[PDB]
């Protein structure tokens, strides 16, 4: 017997797109990368208030010595992000039963056209910069479940890092943790209630969210 969230809120940069290619290219290198996205992870999360999405990508790569042009080569190469395996497939089949929504620490701009390359007609897609806050600041989530309509007991949170668990806690979001790299979990942060190096296993998970 279904019992499906009235909605799934989603991390789109890490969760539903591959980000760590992209970046590593835009890097000139693997190692370049890993530190530039894990340093760009953690200036979101002490930031709080929305600093331009650009300038902390830039502050991020200056921080761990690549060259402040690494962010230009990303902006260059921003409609290569490709969904991971299973992203188009987990929306669609959601679709018919709850309200999807984005919920992503980027720009307005960047975070609309990569919202895009999954070809869903998202019904809310709730950016940092229309936030004012970086997640896991609660106002980012929060918006997306008013703008919806929902309380958060209603409502399942696909996350890419492990970040958004302190957000997720505080806003009563109960979370998915898509973990395709294998991450470890920040220091201090909750449990996910799922966690998994794929996106397949999430659809039966939110299938008996209410049960
Ligand atoms: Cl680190």
Do not use: I, M
């Amino acid at each position: 017997a279904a019992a499906w969230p009235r909605a799934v809120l989603f991390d789109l940069l890490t969760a539903l797109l591959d980000s760590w290619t992209v970046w590593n290219s835009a890097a000139g290198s693997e190692a370049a990368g890993r530190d530039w996205r894990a340093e760009y992870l953690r200036l979101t999360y002490g930031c709080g208030a929305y600093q331009p999405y650009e300038d902390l990508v830039r502050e991020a790569a200056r921080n761990r010595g690549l060259p402040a042009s690494a962010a230009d080569r990303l902006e260059a190469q921003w409609d290569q992000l490709q969904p991971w395996d299973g992203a188009r497939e987990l929306l669609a089949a959601l679709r018919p039963h709850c309200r999807l929504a984005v919920v992503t620490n980027c720009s307005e701009r960047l975070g609309q056209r990569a919202a895009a390359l999954l070809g869903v007609d998202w019904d809310v897609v709730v950016t940092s910069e229309a936030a004012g806050f970086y997640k896991p600041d609660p106002r980012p989530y929060q918006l997306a479940l008013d703008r919806l309509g929902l309380p958060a007991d209603q409502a399942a949170f696909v996350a890419g890092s492990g970040y958004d668990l302190f957000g997720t806690s505080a806003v009563g979001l109960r979370t998915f943790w898509h973990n395709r790299v294998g991450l470890s979990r920040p220091a201090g942060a909750p449990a996910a209630e799922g966690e998994a190096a794929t996106l397949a296993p999430a659809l039966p998970w939110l299938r008996g969210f209410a049960a």
